[PDB]
Structure 1
Amino acid sequence: QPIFLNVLEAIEPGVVCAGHDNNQPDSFAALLSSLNELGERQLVHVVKWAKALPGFRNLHVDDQMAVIQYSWMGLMVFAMGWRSFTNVNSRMLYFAPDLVFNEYRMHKSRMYSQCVRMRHLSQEFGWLQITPQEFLCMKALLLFSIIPVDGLKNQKFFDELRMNYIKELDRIIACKRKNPTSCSRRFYQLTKLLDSVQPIARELHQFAFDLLIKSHMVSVDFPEMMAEIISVQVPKILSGKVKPIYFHTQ
């Protein structure tokens, strides 16, 4: 029985819609208001998903919310890239069924560069032939990929959990591979892909923060929970107090 993968499939969120009005001309304020609403809705699902992951209760209660909050943007990026690949072969960014970005919308959103980096990530899911099971284990690992310089309340419990998710990824890679060289090559590819999420998430964090600071001038609404993340947690990342764990750092 593949217990670990059984769980990851079982907990995977279903479809989340933004509530956007597609039946009006595009505007920056409406697009970003809808993206923010989608982010709030996604956050509720990400919390419920994370809390149901294998071993998640091993973390100190004081650390559980913090790692979700730090990782939320990257998790959104990685899952949206997958949706975009699977649903539309990377032709568009599939933020939600009712919030699909073509290049016009990427431009209108003022996050064109971030968007095209996400489109490239989408493409990579196909070029690398990422399997659904690789995707699920990678996404879980991505939750455990950002830590504070000053330490979590219980860093050792986090460290052990992270280790265990890397071991699961090793197990998934080795399943149909009959050769430690083939396993190594695949691990290299997958860890490179995971590392590539991080600069995208940082760019999106910078945009989110800048937009929140000017939000009252540009008519863009930020829902409560995601606003709190952007004003409390995100600056800790952007100031370097909280940093990603890069597999391939130098």
Structure 2
Amino acid sequence: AAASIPHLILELLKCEPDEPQVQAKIMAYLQQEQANRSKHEKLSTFGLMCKMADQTLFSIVEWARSSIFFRELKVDDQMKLLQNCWSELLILDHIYRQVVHGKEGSIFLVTGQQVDYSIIASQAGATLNNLMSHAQELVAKLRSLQFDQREFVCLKFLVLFSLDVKNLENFQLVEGVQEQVNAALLDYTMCNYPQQTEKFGQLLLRLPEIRAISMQAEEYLYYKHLNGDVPYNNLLIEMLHA
């Protein structure tokens, strides 16, 4: 029968970034970055990925601040929320990209580039391999649950609007978003995936897994930074140093 989408969810969808514009902007930036460099100062694959991730985070901040509800918080509240979840949002973004755009044995990047598992299997160290292995496990789980765009945007809001952060001033708005987004997500899964009787619960149980992978990713990056591998003026490093 007909699909049903809660009104609230429609409102969340409206806040979504223009995916093709972000992709083209990030690719063009990286291509111009590399072209501006002489032969001996070209960025490595890692250096390029660091700049790519930085640009993705810029995009995430711009998504949040233009988002319904979030844009109504004072900057200090906005900062506390983003300080808490920035890496989880990066991970959720990456994971969802694989769920929608990914093909067996490869990884799809924000630039629209595709990277063969084998290329990674060979040139990546054990730390990154472990990270990617856990990310791939979550991707398989979500594909299996038929994770979709409507559920994706609800989870992004639930990750952003955390009641577990200290010294939040407008906690009532945060409570409100948690209450209403949870409700809309539940109504959505019950109506549209009625054969999967526990889909709602199953989706929520992915959240601590997202946190775990985000912590692992932060740790990997911090280590790379301590080795002097991360290019200068990295916004991810500023988020880490906070």
Q: TM-score range by the shorter chain?
A: 0.7 to 0.9
The aligned runs of 1:101-112 (5 Å cut-off) are 102-105=117-120, 108-110=123-125, 111-112=128-129
Question: Which secondary structure does the structure 2 equivalent of 1:93 belong to?
Answer: strand
Distance 2:204 2:239 in 1: 26
> How is 1:142-153 mapped onto 2 (pairs within 5 angstroms)?
142-145=159-162, 147-148=164-165, 150-153=166-169
Tell me, yes or no, if the aligned pair for 2:131 and 2:217 is still in contact at 8 Å.
yes
Report the Cα offset of residue 2 of structure 1. Answer: 4.5
Displacement of 1:178 in angstroms is 6.3
User: Partners in 2 of 1:146 and 1:203 — Cα distance?
Assistant: 22
TM, length-normalised to structure 1: 0.75
Task: Describe the shift of the 1:95–1:57 C-alpha distance in structure 2 as closer, same or farther (beyond 3 A).
Answer: same
Deviation at 1:70, TM superposition (A): 2.6
Which whole-Å CA distance do the structure 2 matches of 1:136 and 1:65 have between them?
20
Q: Which runs of 5+ in 1 are unaligned?
A: 22-28, 233-250
In structure 2, the residue matched to 1:175 is: 191
What SS does structure 2 have at the residue aligned with 1:175?
helix
Residue of structure 2 in register with 1:6 after alignment: 10
Shift of 1:62: 0.6
Aligned residue identity for 1:152: L
Which structure is richer in relative contact order (CA contacts within 8 A, separation 6 or more)? 2
Q: Which runs of 5+ in 2 are unaligned?
A: 35-42
- Give yes or no for contact 1:118–1:200 (8 Å, CA) kept in 2: yes
Normalised to the residue count of structure 2, the TM-score between the two structures is: 0.77
How far residue 56 of structure 1 moved from its aligned partner, in angstroms, is 1.2
Q: What amino acid does structure 2 have at the position aligned with 1:12?
A: E
2:88–2:214 Cα contact (<8 Å) kept: yes
Q: Aligned AA for 1:200?
A: I
CA distance in 1, matches of 2:215, 2:163: 12
What residue is the counterpart of 1:133 in the other structure? Answer: 150
Q: Deviations over 1:86-138 (max 9, x none)?
A: 22235322233136352432553431111111111221221111122112212
SS in 1 for 2:108: strand
Q: In structure 1, which of residues 54, 63, 66 is the aligned counterpart of residue 68 of structure 2? A: 54
CA contact (8 A) 1:43 1:72 kept: yes
Q: State the Cα RMSD in Å.
A: 2.7
Is the 1:63–1:152 contact (alpha carbons within 8 Å) kept by the matching residues of 2?
Answer: yes
How far apart are 1:168 and its partner, in Å? Answer: 2.4
Is residue 230 of structure 1 aligned with residue 234 of structure 2? no
Number of aligned pairs? 218
> Distance in 2 between the 1:42 and 1:161 partners?
24
Matches within 5 A, 1:37-48: 37-48=51-62
% same residue: 20
Judging changes above 3 Å, is the alpha-carbon distance between structure 1 residues 106 and 143 closer, same or farther for their aligned structure 2 residues?
Answer: farther
